[PDB]
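Reviewer comment 2.1 asked that we show a complete input and output for one of the modelled complexes. We chose the chloride ion case, as it is the one discussed in the main text.
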Amino acid sequence: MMTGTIETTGNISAEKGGSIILQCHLSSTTAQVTQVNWEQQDQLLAICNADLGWHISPSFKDRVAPGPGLGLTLQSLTVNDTGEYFCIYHTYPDGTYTGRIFLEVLE
Amino acid sequence: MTGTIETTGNISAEKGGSIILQCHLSSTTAQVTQVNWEQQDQLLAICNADLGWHISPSFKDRVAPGPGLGLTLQSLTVNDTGEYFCIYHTYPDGTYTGRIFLEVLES
Ligand SMILES: [Cl-]
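Response of the prediction step:
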């Protein structure tokens, strides 16, 4: 019933120390994007709210720049950064769409 | 981090009658972007701070918005039995979820 789909930047590799762009895109729906959250299973990274702008959560402020667009740029990568990241689009009237990216930080 | 959700709890109600599902978000000053009413599988309604109520079309006959941020179900059937979720999408806090289990009865 819900027609939106999400593309993402895929399952990726960067190396210890570097940077990476996390990005998604919502296709195939005319619904309004009211907010995008970036999260892990257990943690919030950042929110773009259509009305209010970007908020980066304090534990990531140091090493995360908003954008480009609705994406996120991770800096100073460590091994601990390995795992799943999620771009969560909150929309009206369709509701929540979620894309997934797996990151692996290399030895 | 700081918010908590009260709900109307776990409920029994009678085949054919009506019920109010309600949640309240406390202990956070964060702005509520919208509140989704969902089952595990499906969206029932969204109340969005800018756009107002959307009642999802397949539920329009049996779900009336309100009171406030809650939902009223009418003409319950045994299928209506299950989990309902009130999912607050907020800035800068993120998502808080309240749970309500509905068990619908004969006699
Ligand atoms: Cl807002």
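Residues A 49, 51-52; B 31, 33, 49, 91 surround chloride ion (CB under 6 Å). We note this here for comparison with the apo prediction described in Section 3.2.
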